[PDB]
């Protein structure tokens, strides 16, 4: 009541503080809510939705060619089709996703990462893909027999034309840090290495250079703590129409 | 835990209690 | 639907589920996001009770961070003597969500956003470089007046529009806690359309993306005190904390660097990452692992 | 087990307990610590009710003392003019428990520590020796932004990373109470491993003892106000008070003086006490009493 | 409520204050507790565990020889084997222990000090040790007949090979101060003087210079008040990787 | 005696009331 | 929501709760 | 309406509630 | 009348309520 002593954290401006502040209009009734579709009350509602991974990630791939990986008819078995680093908080193919860009607003993340690959070839293009998420601790597997020891799934294209490799949550800690080092135990996640299983067979009148679009989402076991500023965006200079919103 | 002493409902604390979420709007917008 | 879940959901124990005629991991991306969960296929999971954090990653808690929206450093001297365009001990700032790319990108994850803006004004005084001597930092009382969008804004420090008989103004000192106020959700529509695929006026010459409904107002910030013989660079930093967030239609995050406050015009960096032709920094090949453990 | 004792335990009356076949004072150190209590043997005790203090020596109360973790005195002037490595009106400090040996030794009694860090920032302004004149102490608003470990840290005072749209920042004046904030227990593991017998990365070239999980973050502390013509040594003293302490696996206290923040490398003093070959200051012999009453 | 006057202790930064301060992340859920073994909720849990006393404390004793005392086959009876000063808050053989180093984080201490001596000789090495804690007020007893008047225990080695001399809590005050003077009434504790009782007899093929490791712990009657900074550690200069945790 | 007016449980006062202690973890870790 | 701790009723908060209104005084001042 | 948190009754608010008055002491000091 | 919000009983207000007194300790220390 009347005897009040100021705390050491009094008079400061915390960014994440939640104290109620003063109104400016003393009797402002806002316009009432209408049912706008898609009410978003948590980030997990955006997190578990699929989003294209930048699997190609190569300088010859310009724009549209980056979001797909061109899988071709190989003349020999047991080649690496592609390998995806699963640093969802570091720059990589998982960075330009919903889960990557939104998790880069956080330092600590947890949960299984679903990764759905949709075969965007012809109907007559047949082939089995083996997708192996390898837990961290060793190198990225460039050979299939070193890869299938991890979390591997075998996928025949068929009528469904898409698979979901669910990357499980195997870690010593409850969460994984960002920490700006992809070699760390609490930051390295594993490697999703996709290989030919029984080769991609296309007809001669279908395109040999078939294409695959991969996605990463998560499940409802995902979680995020220690909110931070995302390094995806950055302001080195005051943009256009700033200092023209002041004049 | 709320020290909302002002007469406006919009002046209250940031209500970080809306735990209800529906991911099937955006994950499974089918059938 | 009807999920009032407060933590991350736990997984159940999964056995060998080699059942013919059903396959969970085979899905259709051509419908939406897939429903193949962890104990369904591709892993023989164990029952781990998941007590992980969800309240921190609430969209409320995601967007209730007081981030900078107006850092303006204006000089405080005899501006009336000889100045032309510069801020004559006062600035009218059109309150936009788009001035600083951090909170701009944070609110631009969503198409629609109903929130009250907890505007906190942290104003700092520095001595300008012309004086080149400290001589103490003065206690400056500042008036921040919220003018509606398009209404009559002041033109001077003593412009007689600072009476604030109907306009809402806050008077705050620099030797004080920062000015905490709550601008209401004042949009004429039921959310702030953070993006606007339309034009303001019924004429064809309107500006694209500037809906005046989602324009919050004009913070006219002035020094209430008259001029000192010493000029002072008053750097007023308005941080806006969006509170009582209700968000709608989530969007791709902005990947390319922002160019303009008004529009969503794009120009990436001269090489990847965040370039126009390559958002992600390029690897050597599809088969090449960056930062591979060796 | 199941002891919810709140004071020191009282002793009971002990008589002559010369019983053959049992002896309490004869124990086995090769099992653990001995259970021979005061009324059991070696003293004929009296019943004294022990009402002595226990709440002060609680591990909570032992470690809930706000001790210094970051004393940084950085100059506040035109650093952009000509400086190379020094702190350009701002410093990014990796929040470590190990910078000051008092609280370092206090938290290093335990292997594991779950706590929320009540960070209190007491910032003092002094006039630098180049000016050699007081001219008043300015009221400086400072921003301390908690950046996650490894995330993008600012490079300038006005670096446009200080918007704090998602990062949590506290703005606080020097003519104010010190900035009291509570950094959460944010480790990805269920305690801060104060010691780490391991390496950060899966490569063999990692640093020993630096688990990034137990690295709290990066306090980037800057002057929000622009530069004064007078330079000022701003000595910012971050004191961390560990609160809601849950401690695990207690350890030997650190006896040798600390050498490095990163590791537990050891080099004692050039003579005892706290020397490498002799932690205790040496006596003349086993039979010689230091500070004997004469 | 509205009428609030600031106390004289308002706006200050107390080190030991317990007021609740502001969060930085407004909805941070921490990772949930796992049952890490050995939950330490009080210092008495660490206090009553034995820890080696630096009994030798001599310049020829380097390292390993300091934590043991070499008791030899004496040709004559009634010699002082060793005498230990019981200043648990001052530099001595009890300083480098759990109880000494942890009690030096406090100024006031109370309670009985258990002191367990383990005979680390051979099995065939026989001998009786008389361990006498002498209450303060006089000199340290160099002779046994002046020592056995205090709290003395007679210990035959046997099969158990360890004894516990419980130093009782006899003091005028409820607590004993640190006070930086070992001569004071409220700081001097007593002297644990260990003597030969019936001499140490070893065979010729066993080592004559037998060794003894002593320990001090306490009981549950121990207590600590007036927390202070421990003088065991000390910073005269900013350590390595400080100013490199800033760069 | 607690003036925890913030919405986070980690922001509360230093809970110096955990009087439960088990020294037999460290004193007598046998049988 | 009122922190009127003073002894005068005129010193209270601005009572923005007088929702009763009669426009027929000024709109329809007839019969 | 009283924020008297001190232990003395003389330290309280100015008690402007003594509405009892007797003017017949001074107006009509007769019979 | 006590605003002791801290967790220690020694931190409370100066308890000027110990009205119990025994002068016969010092006035009449006989029989």
UniProtKB/Swiss-Prot annotation, chains B, F, G, H, I:
Myristoylation is required during RNA encapsidation and formation of the mature virus particle. It comes from the Viruses. It is found in: Virion. Lies on the inner surface of the capsid shell. After binding to the host receptor, the capsid undergoes conformational changes. Capsid protein VP4 is released, Capsid protein VP1 N-terminus is externalized, and together, they shape a pore in the host membrane through which the viral genome is translocated into the host cell cytoplasm. Interacts with capsid protein VP1 and capsid protein VP3. This is Capsid protein VP4. It comes from Human enterovirus D68. The lineage of its organism: Viruses, Riboviria, Orthornavirae, Pisuviricota, Pisoniviricetes. The chain holds residues 28 to 58 of 2188 of the full protein.
């Amino acid at each position: 009541g009347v005897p009040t002593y100021l705390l050491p954290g009094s008079g400061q401006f915390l960014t994440t503080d939640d104290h109620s502040s003063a109104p400016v209009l003393p009797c402002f009734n806002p316009t009432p809510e209408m049912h706008i579709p898609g009410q978003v009350r948590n980030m997990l509602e955006v997190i578990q939705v699929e989003s294209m991974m930048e699997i190609n990630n190569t300088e010859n791939a310009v724009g549209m060619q980056r979001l797909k990986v061109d899988i071709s008819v190989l003349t020999d078995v047991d080649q690496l089709l592609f390998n995806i680093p699963l640093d969802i908080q570091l720059d990589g193919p998982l960075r330009n996703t919903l889960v990557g860009n939104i998790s880069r607003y956080y330092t600590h993340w947890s949960g299984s990462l679903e990764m759905t690959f949709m075969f965007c070839g012809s109907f007559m293009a047949t082939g089995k893909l083996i997708l192996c998420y390898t837990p961290p601790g060793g190198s990225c597997p460039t050979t299939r027999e070193t890869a299938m020891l991890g979390t591997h799934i075998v996928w025949d294209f068929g009528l469904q034309s898409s698979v979901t490799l669910v990357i499980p949550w195997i870690s010593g800690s409850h969460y994984r840090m960002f920490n700006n080092d992809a070699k760390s135990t609490n930051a390295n996640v594993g490697y999703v290495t996709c290989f030919m299983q029984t080769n991609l067979i296309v007809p001669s009148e279908s395109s040999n250079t078939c294409s695959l679009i991969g996605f990463v989402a998560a499940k409802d076991d995902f979680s995020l703590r220690l909110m931070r500023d995302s390094p995806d965006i950055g302001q080195l200079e005051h943009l256009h129409e700033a200092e023209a919103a002041y004049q | 835990n709320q020290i909302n002493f002002y007469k406006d409902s919009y002046a209250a604390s940031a209500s970080k209690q809306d735990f209800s979420q529906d991911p099937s709007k955006f994950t499974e917008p089918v059938v | 639907i009807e999920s009032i879940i407060k933590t991350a959901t736990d997984t159940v124990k999964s056995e060998i589920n080699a059942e013919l005629g059903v396959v969970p991991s085979l899905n259709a991306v051509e419908t939406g996001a897939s429903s193949n969960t962890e104990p369904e296929e591709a892993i023989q999971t164990r029952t781990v009770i998941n007590q992980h954090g969800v309240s921190e990653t609430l969209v409320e808690n995601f967007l209730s961070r007081a981030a900078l929206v107006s850092k303006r450093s204006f000089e405080y001297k005899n501006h009336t003597s000889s100045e032309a365009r510069t801020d004559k001990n006062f600035y009218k700032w059109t309150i936009n969500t788009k001035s600083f790319v951090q909170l701009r990108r944070k609110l631009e994850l969503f198409t629609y956003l109903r929130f009250d803006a907890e505007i906190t004004i942290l104003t700092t005084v520095a001595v300008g470089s012309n004086n080149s001597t400290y001589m103490g930092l003065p206690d400056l009382t500042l008036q921040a007046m919220f003018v509606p969008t398009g209404a009559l804004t002041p033109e001077k420090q003593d412009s007689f529009h600072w009476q604030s008989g109907s306009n809402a103004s806050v008077f705050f000192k620099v030797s004080d806690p920062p000015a905490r106020m709550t601008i209401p959700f004042m949009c004429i529509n039921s959310a702030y359309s953070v993006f606007y695929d339309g034009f303001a006026g019924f004429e064809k010459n309107g500006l694209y993306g500037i809906n005046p409904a989602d324009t919050i107002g004009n913070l006219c910030v002035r020094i209430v005190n008259e001029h000192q013989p010493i000029g002072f660079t008053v750097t007023v930093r308005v941080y806006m904390k969006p509170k009582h967030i209700k968000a709608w239609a989530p969007r791709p995050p902005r990947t390319l660097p922002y160019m303009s406050i008004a529009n969503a015009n794009y120009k990436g960096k001269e090489r990847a990452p965040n370039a126009l032709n390559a958002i992600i920094g390029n690897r050597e090949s599809v088969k090449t692992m960056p930062h591979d453990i060796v």
